[PDB]
Amino acid sequence: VQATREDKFSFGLWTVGWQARDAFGDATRTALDPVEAVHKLAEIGAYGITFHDDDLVPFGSDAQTRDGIIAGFKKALDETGLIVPMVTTNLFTHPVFKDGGFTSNDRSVRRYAIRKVLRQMDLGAELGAKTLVLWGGREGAEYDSAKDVSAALDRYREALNLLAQYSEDRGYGLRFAIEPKPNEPRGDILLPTAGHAIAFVQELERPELFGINPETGHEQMSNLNFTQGIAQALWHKKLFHIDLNGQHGPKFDQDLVFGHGDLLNAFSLVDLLENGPDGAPAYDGPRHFDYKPSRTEDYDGVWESAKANIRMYLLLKERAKAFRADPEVQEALAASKVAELKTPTLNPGEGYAELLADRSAFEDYDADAVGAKGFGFVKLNQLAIEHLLGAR
Amino acid sequence: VQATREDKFSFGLWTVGWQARDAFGDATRTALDPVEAVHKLAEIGAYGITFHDDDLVPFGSDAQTRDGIIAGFKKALDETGLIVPMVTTNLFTHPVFKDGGFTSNDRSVRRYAIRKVLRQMDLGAELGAKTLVLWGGREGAEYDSAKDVSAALDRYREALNLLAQYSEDRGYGLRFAIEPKPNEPRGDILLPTAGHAIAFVQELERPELFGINPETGHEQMSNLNFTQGIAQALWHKKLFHIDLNGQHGPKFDQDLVFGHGDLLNAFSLVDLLENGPDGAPAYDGPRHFDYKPSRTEDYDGVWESAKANIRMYLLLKERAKAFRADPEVQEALAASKVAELKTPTLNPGEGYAELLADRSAFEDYDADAVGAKGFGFVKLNQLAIEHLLGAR
Amino acid sequence: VQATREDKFSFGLWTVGWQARDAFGDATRTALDPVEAVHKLAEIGAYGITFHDDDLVPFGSDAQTRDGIIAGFKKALDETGLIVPMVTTNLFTHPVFKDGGFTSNDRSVRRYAIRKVLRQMDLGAELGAKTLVLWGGREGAEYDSAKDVSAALDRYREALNLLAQYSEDRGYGLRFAIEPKPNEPRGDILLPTAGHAIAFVQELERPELFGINPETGHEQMSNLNFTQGIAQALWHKKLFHIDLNGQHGPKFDQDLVFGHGDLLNAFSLVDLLENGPDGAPAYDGPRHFDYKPSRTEDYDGVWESAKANIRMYLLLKERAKAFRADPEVQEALAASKVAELKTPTLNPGEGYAELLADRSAFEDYDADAVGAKGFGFVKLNQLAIEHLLGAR
Amino acid sequence: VQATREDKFSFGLWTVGWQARDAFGDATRTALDPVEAVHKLAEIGAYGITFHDDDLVPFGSDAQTRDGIIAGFKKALDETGLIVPMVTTNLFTHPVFKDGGFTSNDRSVRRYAIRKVLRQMDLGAELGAKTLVLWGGREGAEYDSAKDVSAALDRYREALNLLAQYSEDRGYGLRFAIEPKPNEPRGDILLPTAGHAIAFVQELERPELFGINPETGHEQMSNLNFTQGIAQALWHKKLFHIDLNGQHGPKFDQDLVFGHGDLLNAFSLVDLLENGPDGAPAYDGPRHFDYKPSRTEDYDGVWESAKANIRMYLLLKERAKAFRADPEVQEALAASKVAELKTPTLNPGEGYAELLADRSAFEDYDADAVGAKGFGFVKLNQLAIEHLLGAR
Numbered sequence A, B, C, D: 001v002q003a004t005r006e007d008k009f010s011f012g013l014w015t016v017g018w019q020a021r022d023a024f025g026d027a028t029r030t031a032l033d034p035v036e037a038v039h040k041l042a043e044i045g046a047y048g049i050t051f052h053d054d055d056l057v058p059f060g061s062d063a064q065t066r067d068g069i070i071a072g073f074k075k076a077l078d079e080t081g082l083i084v085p086m087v088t089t090n091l092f093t094h095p096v097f098k099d100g101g102f103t104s105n106d107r108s109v110r111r112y113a114i115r116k117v118l119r120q121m122d123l124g125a126e127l128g129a130k131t132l133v134l135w136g137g138r139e140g141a142e143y144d145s146a147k148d149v150s151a152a153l154d155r156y157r158e159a160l161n162l163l164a165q166y167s168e169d170r171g172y173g174l175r176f177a178i179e180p181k182p183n184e185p186r187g188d189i190l191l192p193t194a195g196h197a198i199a200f201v202q203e204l205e206r207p208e209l210f211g212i213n214p215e216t217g218h219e220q221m222s223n224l225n226f227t228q229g230i231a232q233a234l235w236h237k238k239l240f241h242i243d244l245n246g247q248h249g250p251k252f253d254q255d256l257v258f259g260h261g262d263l264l265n266a267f268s269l270v271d272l273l274e275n276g277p278d279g280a281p282a283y284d285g286p287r288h289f290d291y292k293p294s295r296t297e298d299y300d301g302v303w304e305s306a307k308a309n310i311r312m313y314l315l316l317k318e319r320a321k322a323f324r325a326d327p328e329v330q331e332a333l334a335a336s337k338v339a340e341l342k343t344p345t346l347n348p349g350e351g352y353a354e355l356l357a358d359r360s361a362f363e364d365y366d367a368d369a370v371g372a373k374g375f376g377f378v379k380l381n382q383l384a385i386e387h388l389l390g391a392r
Ligand SMILES: O=C[C@H](O)[C@@H](O)[C@H](O)CO
Pocket: A052, A088, A089, A133, A134, A135, A137, A179, A181, A215, A243, A253, A290
């Protein structure tokens, strides 16, 4: 299979650029030059690149340096045809953010965190980015008495409302995507799941400008069903971006290649995003890989892993397509009544009174007889896996 | 410490009445008589009792029978001075509900599920219940291709909108509390965390009427911080009811006595609910125990475990109070800047233009210096634990 | 593909016979007649059937009744040609076993548990069973102070030594396989992982007669790597039997069809078992399916699910074979140095004195140069998955 | 309370010396001087200090320097009276160990790893250490096809056999303690639980020289019951050392102060270690704290956290003794038949023949009457907790 710009595969500069310094060891790889990253990615089929302010411009660079770096980066995008669909800000690495950015108990840190983001919004706008991703990695706590969650949510809200105000006033037209994570690096992070992030966004001043950027491994760290979570995000129309990667359940954040973790869920996910209503994808944004080339690899291993992500997505798509197109699957879908859930429970114009008067819905209903019919779910499931396995 | 009606301890009929028939063994206790249960609960200090329709009136009882049971039940209530703060409907036991009640693939079951709940609403209304708890235990799936999540949410919403319609027309004054659970009995259940349920509720026709009924153990099954999720629920003003119990992380639902699983989180939870805003509780509803007396116990064990629930709460409350009243704690709270989070990040009348003009929030900000000061959070945590252990 | 008797696929009478009564609901299926189960299994390609004493003969059957059942049973076996490779005893259903069988705190229960087992060994020996599986589902605790573990291990060992004795004296020639499980139905089960069971077995009077019966989902309930634990069981030579099924990480025991849980781990498990050293399988006992047809299915779904287990195993076996015969996979293996681990670290005849003498092992070792070479693990993992996907 | 040298509280240099560089951010604390560490710890009550070669002497220090550091370190011990009970080797930080030390696919790395340990054994022997802790943090894999587990166990064994040989020949008198961990930093680590580690040790050439060093957080990362695992380790007589800390279930390794994670299990653990048979502790080695002062803390928080470890153990000890001494507890233990588990199942001289002859153990046994009696476990648990809360 071959990747096209229409596939919209994007990679964070911090992904292929991860030097592999983990919590227990030193880096095993040298630093990647942003310009080189741009050329390599272009080469493997990516349509865009993303970055944290500090990934491109070293924290504390003078404007002369800063400016120089932006200029070169800009050239590279130019020559290669790559776009910058999203930008984000690093509010977790520097020691000042040890208790968070937007929700640090220290007031001065909160003012500083907003400034850092405003600045990144400026660069984003200049490069044509449409989405600002906010990953509140340090917002949370290790101890319950150390953080007033209520106050914290008020402060998270206060900061986001200002950001939307500014973007709207400067006419940047950005969309904001809150990225949920349950833990790591804080004992517990605020807005731990896709659900909590969506509920929170609904309380902002201009909620229509806000959505979520769910990550495969983040939901899997709590042993949740990522596909089902995305389905809910789509129902709400809050899926503004997505970070794809792999994880093996509740343990540290692994960031494996997409599909190298829960393979069955990777399959149902591609199916959900691609076999949307009327042939068309249910999702239109970037298919962004927020992963890390394993610590045991060298740059060869790095480019390999970059391509594996694209490969995995395209192989899965291909099988998801075939699954749905199979008349035997179509038949099994019918038997399991999957589409019958789309029919309203109530007849047209029917209310409580008409339902209360319908004896077939209760008084004359044979629950025992209906309770005995099988749904044929194992069989439908087995058909899906045989398609995944290329055995059908 | 002794329980008062003011404490508002309530228990489900199904908790003390659980016969301890589990997934791998027969019942070890005989059935508990409801009148008996009312009488025993009144005696241990409970102010109220709750029940699923099928816990009181056996599935399929003729009207004569059903009518007789209610009459006896009401009399017991009468005599003991116990109220019915909440009622719920069993939409999970009978085989007809094997693929869900409101979201079953089968349209006829969905219709029947609504009828079963309307009927329970009438009875709750009759007994003076204020809350209708909805636990969608069979809503979800074992395989991703078996359930269209989107359509399922539409149907869950279609059903709730109708229930609210009816309650409102009839003047019942009920409040609806959705109860989230990540799994069990289904592989994955729709609306798995407190967050997912709050986000969903914000999408119904009369949202003001809807909230959640989170359960200690259900959030812990995903390894989430229960106190922290309750904090967010209170922030959204959607904590309509609470189910208290104990659990040991992600494994089957244990339903232990409150405080017998994660004790530290049980402590921070009581602190949150009781050491509210004024001096007053932050939550005013029933303190409901949704637990199960261990299968190894007889009826002496059952009554002991009921009392243990009340005892754990009162003991934790007492230590939470003492913690907050301690001068050394006040000092640790001041050093950790807990209260500083409550001060707006921005000065009154400050917007992005003023923030951008503040050189001190960025250009002249000494992040290195700020990042070197400690928050003293361990010390604060240590004082909290010492209060819990009665060591101070 | 089609299963042959050489494949050695076996099923427990309790798998296809599960009536689907779970922790939250009634059975959805009627009971399966054992003779009918024998015929249906033979028909789908199973070579054997296994059972708990109470699956075949209802608890408390008089001797005439029990004898009658056993005889009809044997006739079915005879006519179909199916064998009984393993038998087991139910020490978890009856209320008497609420605190365990061999380790109940109650002495009389421990004496009864041993007699229930001895009686099953006789029947096993008469049906030709070669393995007795021991699953101590009720040995454990919900509270730490309720059970003396040391005393419990002593009692466990005391019971197992007697069983080996009787078997050896009767010339039964049975091998014993302890089945580990972390929790469910007890909060914590004794001998929680394959590791704990192996270490325990090593302390018996006649260790050579004892091994383990690990189950896919049981190790996954603790989020452990099943293939890797099986690899270690094989290194100790204690894999006496195996239970294959599917699970989705830490949650109640799902008992899905094999391969329907962690697909990638199922794949590597089949590779380990069949692509053993010397062309041949690394394991030669039964490939036993200890699973449950989902509660949503009827008898058609039950047989579909039985056949899905065998199809899953054969498909994965085919892909594991092709994987290994791929010259590109071989080249990747060589590049990743997998086989180089099989070469002793020390030279023949080298001891610490000679090692200490080798400056190339330390003094002149360039750690930094070695440290920079990639292992090519990602690329290898990618080829593995492409084989599973039928993309190669 | 106050710590005495008889409490044997020890700490690793890497604990209070952790600079707080995590997977997502820079160090928030400067480096701690080892002599100072010796002094500081002596002051808070520790009786000993431990370290990794590389904690003390910077990786790649010339002989002169190394010698220099050791001599200063020896003086500080001298001056303060602290001992070095255990020493360990760093086989996880340097890039050369990315695929492991002892089981690296690369043979040259395995040879180098052995040399690096021999050298630490010498320094350990010279400082009077009695235990060599072996933590194979990089032993494992991210991908199943990348590591031959059987070969890795052979190589692990091969390296340990040699270390034992050396120690015995040099007359060092060291005992070896293998430390199990399920994951982090490798996706899956070899010897993931205390169980797997004990089983392994039993296969070595001089097993009497090997035991384990289980860590509270490591077992909790897999959601296992720490106390129960230590109870099994003591049964086997393999508890050579112990690492105490706190953790909040399956997530990244938190390394909190002991008792700051699962409080109830920290209580039962202290009870098991101290309320041993013959009044005396069941365990007499060092109570070693392998924890990390939270990243939000400065050097004051660091010493605060060090003291917290000691305070937690002593407060728990105090409650564990009060618990056992309480007459009501004594009455609950009796009703729970906790001690009846210590009486053999069989009468002295009884074997299967006499057991079979006992109609009362089977034919005339009333399983139903026995099954109806409760064990009073909930009451017993409640008393334990009230003792922990200082409520009794
Ligand atoms: O787990 C870390 C996050 O996934 C991070 O990469 C964000 O997506 C960007 O700040």
